[PDB]
Amino acid sequence: AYTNSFTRGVYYPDKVFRSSVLHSTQDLFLPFFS
Amino acid sequence: LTESNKKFLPFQQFGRDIADTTDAVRDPQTLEILDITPCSFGGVSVITP
């Protein structure tokens, strides 16, 4: 069967730390509601 | 340098800045997080009559 992954499959893309920023990353991700 | 309260995950060793500059580091020998801050600078104005 099938089901919908709402906002799952989300990880930290890089080996670096950030804080209180909105960071854009083009990486291997799981699309939302997939 | 200075002690920092940032949390670096075990794989995380360097924290980058907006300008892709490391603004916080993890020491390879001791696993503690250090603050980074560029040294003071500024123009030198000369006031003269």
* Contact at CB, A16 and B14, closer than 8 angstroms: yes
Rounded to whole angstroms, the Cα distance separating B45 from B22 reads 31
Q: How far is A22 from chain B (nearest CA, A)?
A: 11
What chain B residue is nearest to A22 in terms of C-alpha separation?
B18
* Contact at CB, A12 and B16, closer than 8 angstroms: no
| Residues paired with residue B26 on neighbouring β-strands, in sequence order | B33
For A1-34, the DSSP string reads -----SS-S----SSEE--S------S----TT-
- Expressed in Å, this structure's resolution amounts to 2.5
The method of structure determination was cryo-EM
Rounded to whole angstroms, the Cα distance separating A18 from B31 reads 18
**Which are the residues after which chain A is interrupted (C to N > 2.5 Å)?**
none
Contacts of A18 in chain B (CB under 8 A): 15-16
Residues for chain B: how many in total? 49
